Design an enzyme around this catalytic site. Sequence first.
Site, PDB file in Angstrom:
ATOM      1  N   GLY A  13      94.714  73.567  54.671  1.00 36.94           N
ATOM      2  CA  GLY A  13      93.685  73.304  53.692  1.00 36.94           C
ATOM      3  C   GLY A  13      93.764  74.197  52.477  1.00 36.94           C
ATOM      4  O   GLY A  13      94.639  75.056  52.378  1.00 36.94           O
ATOM      5  N   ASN A  14      92.853  73.973  51.535  1.00 36.55           N
ATOM      6  CA  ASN A  14      92.698  74.873  50.401  1.00 36.55           C
ATOM      7  C   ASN A  14      91.282  74.915  49.843  1.00 36.55           C
ATOM      8  O   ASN A  14      90.465  74.021  50.079  1.00 36.55           O
ATOM      9  CB  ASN A  14      93.729  74.591  49.296  1.00 36.55           C
ATOM     10  CG  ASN A  14      93.711  73.149  48.816  1.00 36.55           C
ATOM     11  OD1 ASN A  14      92.682  72.648  48.364  1.00 36.55           O
ATOM     12  ND2 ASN A  14      94.861  72.483  48.891  1.00 36.55           N
ATOM     13  N   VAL A  20      95.577  77.679  52.678  1.00 37.40           N
ATOM     14  CA  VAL A  20      95.742  78.049  54.077  1.00 37.40           C
ATOM     15  C   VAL A  20      96.830  77.220  54.767  1.00 37.40           C
ATOM     16  O   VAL A  20      96.790  75.985  54.732  1.00 37.40           O
ATOM     17  CB  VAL A  20      94.415  77.877  54.839  1.00 37.40           C
ATOM     18  CG1 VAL A  20      94.578  78.298  56.293  1.00 37.40           C
ATOM     19  CG2 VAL A  20      93.299  78.661  54.150  1.00 37.40           C
ATOM     20  N   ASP A 128      77.908  80.953  51.366  1.00 36.74           N
ATOM     21  CA  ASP A 128      78.765  79.773  51.214  1.00 36.74           C
ATOM     22  C   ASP A 128      78.888  78.938  52.476  1.00 36.74           C
ATOM     23  O   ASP A 128      79.962  78.433  52.787  1.00 36.74           O
ATOM     24  CB  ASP A 128      80.160  80.139  50.702  1.00 36.74           C
ATOM     25  CG  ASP A 128      80.800  79.001  49.903  1.00 36.74           C
ATOM     26  OD1 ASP A 128      80.107  78.003  49.648  1.00 36.74           O
ATOM     27  OD2 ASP A 128      81.984  79.106  49.519  1.00 36.74           O
TER      28      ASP A 128
HETATM   29  N1  AGS Z   1      91.419  80.227  60.670  1.00 32.83           N
HETATM   30  C1  AGS Z   1      91.566  78.947  60.221  1.00 32.83           C
HETATM   31  N2  AGS Z   1      92.054  77.966  61.023  1.00 32.83           N
HETATM   32  C2  AGS Z   1      92.194  76.692  60.593  1.00 32.83           C
HETATM   33  N3  AGS Z   1      91.876  76.270  59.353  1.00 32.83           N
HETATM   34  C3  AGS Z   1      91.377  77.149  58.441  1.00 32.83           C
HETATM   35  C4  AGS Z   1      91.186  78.564  58.836  1.00 32.83           C
HETATM   36  N4  AGS Z   1      90.675  79.198  57.759  1.00 32.83           N
HETATM   37  C5  AGS Z   1      90.548  78.278  56.763  1.00 32.83           C
HETATM   38  N5  AGS Z   1      90.962  77.053  57.169  1.00 32.83           N
HETATM   39  C6  AGS Z   1      90.966  75.807  56.357  1.00 32.83           C
HETATM   40  O1  AGS Z   1      91.278  76.077  54.986  1.00 32.83           O
HETATM   41  C7  AGS Z   1      90.174  75.776  54.125  1.00 32.83           C
HETATM   42  C8  AGS Z   1      90.043  76.816  53.018  1.00 32.83           C
HETATM   43  O2  AGS Z   1      89.794  78.048  53.684  1.00 32.83           O
HETATM   44  P1  AGS Z   1      88.730  79.107  53.115  1.00 32.83           P
HETATM   45  O3  AGS Z   1      88.886  80.445  53.821  1.00 32.83           O
HETATM   46  O4  AGS Z   1      87.415  78.374  53.206  1.00 32.83           O
HETATM   47  O5  AGS Z   1      89.212  79.246  51.578  1.00 32.83           O
HETATM   48  P2  AGS Z   1      88.206  79.228  50.314  1.00 32.83           P
HETATM   49  O6  AGS Z   1      89.057  78.840  49.133  1.00 32.83           O
HETATM   50  O7  AGS Z   1      87.480  80.565  50.220  1.00 32.83           O
HETATM   51  O8  AGS Z   1      87.123  78.036  50.630  1.00 32.83           O
HETATM   52  P3  AGS Z   1      85.750  77.780  49.745  1.00 32.83           P
HETATM   53  O9  AGS Z   1      85.356  79.058  49.020  1.00 32.83           O
HETATM   54  O10 AGS Z   1      84.714  77.156  50.658  1.00 32.83           O
HETATM   55  S1  AGS Z   1      86.078  76.338  48.289  1.00 32.83           S
HETATM   56  C9  AGS Z   1      88.969  75.751  55.041  1.00 32.83           C
HETATM   57  O11 AGS Z   1      87.972  74.857  54.549  1.00 32.83           O
HETATM   58  C10 AGS Z   1      89.554  75.272  56.353  1.00 32.83           C
HETATM   59  O12 AGS Z   1      89.612  73.847  56.409  1.00 32.83           O
END
Ligand code: AGS
EC number: 2.7.11.22
Lengths: 297, 180
Positions: A13-14, A20, A128
């Site tokens: 994801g991202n 990620v 968040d």
């Molecule tokens: N430990 C994990 N295991 C599996 N998938 C993950 C994990 N951490 C993150 N993801 C996936 O990657 C996405 C982005 O990770 P985040 O840590 O939420 O990054 P972010 O850019 O800070 O997200 P925001 O601030 O909500 S837009 C998440 O919504 C999950 O779908």
Amino acid sequence: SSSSQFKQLEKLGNGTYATVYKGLNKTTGVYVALKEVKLDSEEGTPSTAIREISLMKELKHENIVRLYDVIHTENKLTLVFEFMDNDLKKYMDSRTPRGLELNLVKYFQWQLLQGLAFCHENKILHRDLKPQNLLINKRGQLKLGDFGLARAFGIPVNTFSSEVVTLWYRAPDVLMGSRTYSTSIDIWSCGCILAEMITGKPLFPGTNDEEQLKLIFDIMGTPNESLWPSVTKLPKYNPNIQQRPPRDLRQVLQPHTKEPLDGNLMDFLHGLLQLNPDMRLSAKQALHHPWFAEYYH
Amino acid sequence: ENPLLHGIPVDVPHISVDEALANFKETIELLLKLSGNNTRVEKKEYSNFYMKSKPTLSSADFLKRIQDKCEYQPTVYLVATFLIDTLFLTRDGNNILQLKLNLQEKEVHRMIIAAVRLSTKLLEDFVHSHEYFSKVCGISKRLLTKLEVSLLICVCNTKLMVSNRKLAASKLLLNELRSF
Ligand SMILES: Nc1ncnc2c1ncn2[C@@H]1O[C@H](COP(=O)(O)OP(=O)(O)OP(O)(O)=S)[C@@H](O)[C@H]1O
Ligand SMILES: [Mg+2]
């Protein structure tokens, strides 16, 4: 650390600041999540990663994702997390239906509040909470993740941001300019998330600050100074606008799910979505709501 | 739960910027002097604060500039100082302090910036720009970046979650360094 320590795999994801990927520890054979942060020498190290890293070596709980390591390679910071199979959105999307059965909901909400109660016990606001930031795994564990917008409260801080929490999950008092929210902000999000789990649909799909308030009041009625006197303090508060009473929540919801929405559930939902910040249940007292009775002694 | 806190009211600091800026500078000297007497990438990331030439702005005056051009609140300089603490200090089985690593004046200047911006980035929902500060420190924004990641890398294995106790421990760990 050591980049060679992990083999990168498929993108999981991202978000705004990071991408990620699934990853595999070459030694222990165990899978991880590789949160990659871009480090442009011109913009700097993102405050999010910094907050995420600091807030994780200290916040350890079975409902909060675990940070294992932090690798610093060429213009890139990788935060290595424990590997989770889904996030709540994907999980629900993969069932697309699309709302969840009420024992799953109770079981996921319960775990949300458990992890949340711990954050607040530690004076940490998540800021968040939304399904994309709630990770779920095969055992069915749910864990709060994405602590990038998190912040310690109780302390003197100068700068302000009422621009935190993705819009659909942001509290009315924030939308109206409150710069003194505490834990009530996270609770509102949990209220939204609860609804979304039951119906499969976001509760307040706003496209901007004003449409978001309109959506909230359409369902929660307009702010009622008798029930929220301090409302008059908020900068974007408008007294003149037309009154609008709360709708019957059980009625706005029940259509979108074949499961019967009982009294506890709806009550519990009203406690989370109280317009008046100070009237919203705390995590701790949500945990003890009768709706969770079967979970207790 | 973090040695450097072992012995502080988990309840437990109304200080002014002069009071704040004072302790930081203090801790530095003490650390510089007491130094004389856990992995590779850790030390690798620490090579940075070490500038060969002599810091054009005297250490003390150097902070005077920054508080002027940046005008921070006491908090900033406190947190800033704990990073130094947590980076270099630790208690032993008898709650007696000990030195983790050796701090040199050749490394002090860059270490100062690191702690402060890093500190603010922990505190505020809004900080100065990467060049507004890269400027305030006569620093290449590319180095500034390298000095955030350097510090962060070196201390991340300590509890950096900000809280009043950690804020307090700044000034206290100072006392426990002196005498009397
Ligand atoms: N430990 C994990 N295991 C599996 N998938 C993950 C994990 N951490 C993150 N993801 C996936 O990657 C996405 C982005 O990770 P985040 O840590 O939420 O990054 P972010 O850019 O800070 O997200 P925001 O601030 O909500 S837009 C998440 O919504 C999950 O779908
Ligand atoms: Mg996300």
